[PDB]
Amino acid sequence: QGVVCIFGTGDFGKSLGLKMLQCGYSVVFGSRNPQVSSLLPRGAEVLCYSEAASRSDVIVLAVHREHYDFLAELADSLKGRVLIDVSNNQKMNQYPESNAEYLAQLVPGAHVVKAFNTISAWALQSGTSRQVFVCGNDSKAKDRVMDIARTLGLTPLDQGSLVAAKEIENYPLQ
């Protein structure tokens, strides 16, 4: 399989990265501090966000909505890439716009696809629902994310356009 980029090196990023390496992807991490990488897998490459962006066409945004802001200055080197929003909020109606729609405007030249938000960090390793709700405004971007979902052992369901994102984000809260 090809290359995938994971922005962020926390619980979700690490867990997905490891699973993706195990399924045959090459993985590149984007990080604020790529000189700290002890807990990251020897097979992944670890770079600054700007450099990680240019290494792949698919970028998993393993960051919380609260720290999306840095993407605004990168939005030029994210042009034409797939950006997977995996985010949840801590509580219902915490924001008037869906996180994935907010990202879509922070980065107007990327194709945003919502996916993976209902998978717990480390559930891909423990082998303990396989369903993944996917939405987005571009079918080529969505189909690419759905293929990733299947290669990881998951069952993706196309819920429509990015307007479906709010309900997908609400799902683990309710």
Ligand X SMILES: NC(=O)c1ccc[n+]([C@@H]2O[C@H](COP(=O)([O-])OP(=O)(O)OC[C@H]3O[C@@H](n4cnc5c(N)ncnc54)[C@H](OP(=O)(O)O)[C@@H]3O)[C@@H](O)[C@H]2O)c1
Task: Output 126 or 140, the one with its CB closest to ligand X.
Answer: 126
Strand extents, DSSP E, the chain: 3-7, 26-31, 45-48, 58-61, 82-85, 111-114, 131-136, 155-158
- Rounded least distance, CB 58 to ligand X, Å: 16
Of 13 and 136, nearer to ligand X (C-beta) is 13
Residue nearest to ligand X (CB): 10
Residue 157: strand pairing partners: 133
Report the residue number, 32 or 139, with the smaller CB distance to ligand X: 32
> Distance of CA 39 to CAs 15, 102, 137, 148, Å?
11, 31, 35, 24
Count of residues touching ligand X (by CB under 6 A): 19
String of contacts with ligand X for each residue 107-126, x by CB under 6 A = ----------x-xxx-----
Q: Which residue's CB is nearer to ligand X, number 8 or number 156?
A: 8
Binding residues for NADP(+): 9-12, 31-32, 49, 63-67, 88, 121, 150
Which SS3 state, helix, strand or coil, does residue 72 take?
Answer: helix
State the residue for tokens 């993985």. Answer: 27
Using CA atoms, how far apart are residues 58 and 36, in angstroms rounded to an integer? 23
Establish if 67 lies at the interface with ligand X (CB under 6 A).
yes
Residue 130 in the binding site for ligand X (CB under 6 A): no
**Is residue 87 involved in binding ligand X (CB under 6 A)?**
yes
Q: Whole-angstrom Cα distance, residue 110 to residue 75? A: 8
Q: Does 11 bind ligand X (CB under 6 A)?
A: yes
By CB under 6 A, residue 160 contacts ligand X? no
In whole angstroms, give the CA distance from residue 126 to residue 149.
17
For residue 15 the two structure tokens come to 């867990």
Binding status of residue 41 toward ligand X by CB under 6 A: no
Question: Given the rule CB under 6 A, which residues bind ligand X?
Answer: 8-13, 31-32, 62-64, 67, 86-88, 117, 119-121
